[PDB]
Scaffold this motif. Structure first.
Motif, PDB file in Angstrom:
ATOM      1  N   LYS A   1       1.159  -4.136 -43.962  1.00  0.00           N
ATOM      2  CA  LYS A   1       1.838  -5.219 -44.631  1.00  0.00           C
ATOM      3  C   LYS A   1       1.535  -6.400 -43.362  1.00  0.00           C
ATOM      4  O   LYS A   1       1.895  -6.923 -43.931  1.00  0.00           O
ATOM      5  CB  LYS A   1       3.880  -4.755 -45.674  1.00  0.00           C
ATOM      6  N   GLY A   2       1.835  -6.017 -42.020  1.00  0.00           N
ATOM      7  CA  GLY A   2       1.249  -6.940 -41.234  1.00  0.00           C
ATOM      8  C   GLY A   2       2.931  -7.281 -41.246  1.00  0.00           C
ATOM      9  O   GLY A   2       2.698  -8.895 -40.747  1.00  0.00           O
ATOM     10  N   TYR A   3       3.895  -7.633 -41.630  1.00  0.00           N
ATOM     11  CA  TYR A   3       5.332  -8.402 -41.532  1.00  0.00           C
ATOM     12  C   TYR A   3       6.907  -7.178 -40.960  1.00  0.00           C
ATOM     13  O   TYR A   3       6.348  -5.977 -41.063  1.00  0.00           O
ATOM     14  CB  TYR A   3       5.403  -9.225 -41.841  1.00  0.00           C
ATOM     15  N   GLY A   4       7.721  -8.134 -40.401  1.00  0.00           N
ATOM     16  CA  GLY A   4       8.785  -6.973 -39.833  1.00  0.00           C
ATOM     17  C   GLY A   4       9.627  -7.974 -40.120  1.00  0.00           C
ATOM     18  O   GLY A   4       9.778  -9.641 -40.324  1.00  0.00           O
ATOM     19  N   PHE A   5      10.934  -7.993 -39.018  1.00  0.00           N
ATOM     20  CA  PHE A   5      11.749  -9.037 -38.466  1.00  0.00           C
ATOM     21  C   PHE A   5      12.239  -8.245 -36.772  1.00  0.00           C
ATOM     22  O   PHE A   5      12.150  -7.502 -36.107  1.00  0.00           O
ATOM     23  CB  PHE A   5      13.429  -8.243 -38.938  1.00  0.00           C
ATOM     24  N   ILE A   6      12.756  -9.408 -36.001  1.00  0.00           N
ATOM     25  CA  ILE A   6      13.107  -9.312 -34.151  1.00  0.00           C
ATOM     26  C   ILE A   6      14.813  -9.642 -34.834  1.00  0.00           C
ATOM     27  O   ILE A   6      15.465  -9.918 -35.559  1.00  0.00           O
ATOM     28  CB  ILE A   6      12.673 -10.846 -34.173  1.00  0.00           C
ATOM     29  N   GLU A   7      15.094  -8.408 -34.205  1.00  0.00           N
ATOM     30  CA  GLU A   7      16.621  -8.456 -33.903  1.00  0.00           C
ATOM     31  C   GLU A   7      17.380  -9.749 -32.543  1.00  0.00           C
ATOM     32  O   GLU A   7      16.396  -9.556 -31.573  1.00  0.00           O
ATOM     33  CB  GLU A   7      16.858  -7.518 -34.192  1.00  0.00           C
ATOM     34  N   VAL A   8      17.997 -10.304 -32.999  1.00  0.00           N
ATOM     35  CA  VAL A   8      18.531 -11.300 -32.492  1.00  0.00           C
ATOM     36  C   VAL A   8      20.295 -10.715 -31.849  1.00  0.00           C
ATOM     37  O   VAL A   8      20.997 -10.596 -32.358  1.00  0.00           O
ATOM     38  CB  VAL A   8      18.629 -12.370 -32.408  1.00  0.00           C
ATOM     39  N   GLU A   9      20.418 -10.758 -30.628  1.00  0.00           N
ATOM     40  CA  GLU A   9      21.494 -10.533 -29.862  1.00  0.00           C
ATOM     41  C   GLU A   9      22.842 -11.266 -30.568  1.00  0.00           C
ATOM     42  O   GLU A   9      22.366 -12.830 -29.765  1.00  0.00           O
ATOM     43  CB  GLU A   9      21.936 -10.336 -28.173  1.00  0.00           C
ATOM     44  N   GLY A  10      23.646 -10.982 -30.969  1.00  0.00           N
ATOM     45  CA  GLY A  10      24.356 -11.990 -31.954  1.00  0.00           C
ATOM     46  C   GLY A  10      24.455 -13.629 -32.965  1.00  0.00           C
ATOM     47  O   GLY A  10      25.044 -13.844 -33.281  1.00  0.00           O
ATOM     48  N   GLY A  11      23.193 -13.021 -33.299  1.00  0.00           N
ATOM     49  CA  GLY A  11      22.407 -14.016 -34.278  1.00  0.00           C
ATOM     50  C   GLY A  11      21.624 -13.256 -35.490  1.00  0.00           C
ATOM     51  O   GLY A  11      21.775 -12.132 -35.651  1.00  0.00           O
ATOM     52  N   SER A  12      21.267 -13.897 -36.644  1.00  0.00           N
ATOM     53  CA  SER A  12      20.232 -13.554 -37.712  1.00  0.00           C
ATOM     54  C   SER A  12      19.302 -13.041 -37.409  1.00  0.00           C
ATOM     55  O   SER A  12      18.331 -13.889 -36.494  1.00  0.00           O
ATOM     56  CB  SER A  12      20.224 -14.140 -38.365  1.00  0.00           C
ATOM     57  N   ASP A  13      18.797 -11.919 -38.099  1.00  0.00           N
ATOM     58  CA  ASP A  13      17.543 -11.595 -38.139  1.00  0.00           C
ATOM     59  C   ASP A  13      16.327 -12.488 -38.172  1.00  0.00           C
ATOM     60  O   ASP A  13      16.717 -13.269 -39.223  1.00  0.00           O
ATOM     61  CB  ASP A  13      17.592  -9.889 -39.283  1.00  0.00           C
TER      62      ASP A  13
END
Lengths: 66, 66
Positions: free
Chosen positions: B13-25
């Motif tokens: 599908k070509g998409y996803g999420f990045i996870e952030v230390e102490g913050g929102s995806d």
């Protein structure tokens, strides 16, 4: 997307502006350009794109050469 | 600009999420990924990115694989 014409683009500096109908020019950086080609644009070039808000205000995203 | 890691990425599908230390995806679409090669990301991959706001809400831009 949205549509407009490259007002100017400096391929040394890597940025320029996109002119839009009924709107302010929209900053465009080379990192937004789509496609395998070299990431440059030329005065008068037709493009489709998205307007997104970054820390410096409005800017183009997903810039596709038409 | 900041760093994070790829949480997940659906290659088809070509998409996803990045996870952030102490913050929102942060949502990431393939069109934001920098560099040459097939536009994709792998779970766990460290990345640098910027956050912009579009019509769908916050999303990544200028995603660089470290």
């Amino acid at each position: 997307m949205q549509r407009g014409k490259v007002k100017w683009f400096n391929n040394e500096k890597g940025y320029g502006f996109i002119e839009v109908e009924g709107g302010s020019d929209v900053f465009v950086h080379f990192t937004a350009i789509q496609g395998e080609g070299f990431k440059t644009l030329e005065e008068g070039q037709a493009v489709s794109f998205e307007i997104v808000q970054g820390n410096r205000g409005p800017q183009a995203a997903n810039v596709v050469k038409l």
